Ligand binder design. Structure first.
Ligand SMILES: [Mg+2]
Ligand SMILES: [Mg+2]
Ligand SMILES: [Mg+2]
Ligand SMILES: [Mg+2]
Ligand SMILES: [Mg+2]
Lengths: 259, 262
């Protein structure tokens, strides 16, 4: 059975990773992918590869869907990985990036991991036990109406009218700049909601479980329910401000650029 | 008294407020000021009170210009001046318990001699001592690498500018992030992690420390017109890497400027 043992294994792999990264930084190399803002490093690739390796060693039946490798891909043990979510923050700030890891058994979220390596905070989620930040149990956050909550989203990728209407309806706006971590601030009850209008499946894979066990909302921007295997325009939200955010997003002909 | 003796006293009084803040947080109470979003807490108040008490107890003749008390005294002619934002980022403190800081700057006859931005939630004390340099927990900071704007993240408040100039800043910049406390957003510029941070209406206490960080680490710190800033008064302000400063100002001042109405 237990997830609990697989979790001990995963957590001991993270301890391993913690000692590997300073080396990977030491010889850091930087490339761009499709455009000058789409960055990859040796850090991103080596973490992925090392889990690909871990998985082969201890879990050869298990498959891996992940950002820095091709995928293809009805699957029984699936891991989803963003080896460095927030690569732009790694490169420019050496701060505010994370590892995102999530395990799915017959489509159902079983374990989930967001590792804030720079602050040495490991958020984890385990079906049957709960969500934890470095061992302390995380509890359902207090209700947050939109009008009292801080929100996070990319303003660059939306028309300014609906950016305005979000500004007007919320307490304030902030942005960390990594899905995993803005999402975690919603979990921790510090942001009311996080939006990403075009995530990949690895950008959001761990959030399903956190959301389930901490009583958050996680949907498409049409309220629907997200296929973990493909992305979708998504939101993670306090329960008390979810409907309101989506309503504003879909108003006046939608959030899309131009207009 | 040797600044190193004064600094020893301050770092130490900042260090001890660690023991105090947790309990003040667990009894957090909140009042409003200019309007319902202009927040102040038991935390802001007690840290200021406890500093003023410290200053009376240790440098009787010095003076405190600070956020949560009136500053009618002054004016240009005071020898020993401290300026303090007891909690900068009060909104963040209330909502997140993270990304707030304490600002202090000592000025001897107008000239900044010591500066402190204490990032309490991650326990990172930033300090700058004239003659010594700038430090983060005693790890020494040096001038950052040149950052052109299109290679740089910027930080600013997108809600108080007209959405065209906002768009223009996005467009010309690598990306946008916001921490939401001036002192911390400023420090990211100081560390070279952001190319620049803008605040279009700071008070003296939101920017008091940064003068010296900027001088010692070769940053540009100016009004949104390029001129010197008078530390007794606010101005619309920027603090920047040297390579992106002119460009950010050009963008701000174009097509009637950065105000909602141009
Ligand atoms: Mg990438
Ligand atoms: Mg990634
Ligand atoms: Mg205030
Ligand atoms: Mg303040
Ligand atoms: Mg302030």
């Amino acid at each position: 059975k237990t997830l609990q043992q697989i979790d001990k294994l995963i957590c001991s792999w993270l301890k391993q990773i913690d000692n590997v990264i300073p080396q990977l930084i030491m010889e850091m190399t930087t490339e761009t992918k499709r455009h000058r803002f789409d960055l990859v490093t040796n850090v991103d690739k080596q973490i992925q590869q090392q889990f690909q390796q871990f998985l082969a060693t201890y879990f050869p039946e298990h498959q891996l869907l992940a950002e820095e490798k091709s995928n293809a891909m009805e699957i029984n043990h699936l891991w989803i990985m963003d080896p460095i979510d927030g690569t732009a923050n790694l490169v420019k700030q050496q701060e505010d990036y994370c590892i995102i890891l999530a395990y799915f058994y017959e489509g159902k979220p079983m374990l989930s991991y967001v590792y804030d390596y720079p602050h040495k905070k490991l958020y984890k989620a385990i079906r049957g036990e709960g969500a934890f930040c470095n061992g302390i149990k995380m509890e359902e956050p207090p209700s947050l109406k939109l009008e009292d909550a801080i929100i996070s989203f990319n303003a660059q990728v939306m028309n300014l009218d609906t950016v305005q209407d979000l500004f007007d309806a919320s307490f304030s706006y902030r942005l960390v700049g990594a899905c995993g971590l803005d999402s975690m601030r919603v979990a921790k009850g510090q942001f009311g909601a996080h939006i990403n209008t075009n995530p990949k499946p690895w950008d959001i894979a761990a959030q399903f479980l956190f959301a389930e066990l901490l009583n958050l909302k996680m949907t498409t921007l049409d309220g629907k329910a997200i296929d973990h295997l493909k992305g979708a325009p998504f939101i993670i939200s306090n329960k008390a401000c979810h409907e309101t955010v989506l309503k504003i997003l879909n108003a006046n002909g939608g959030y899309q650029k131009y207009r």
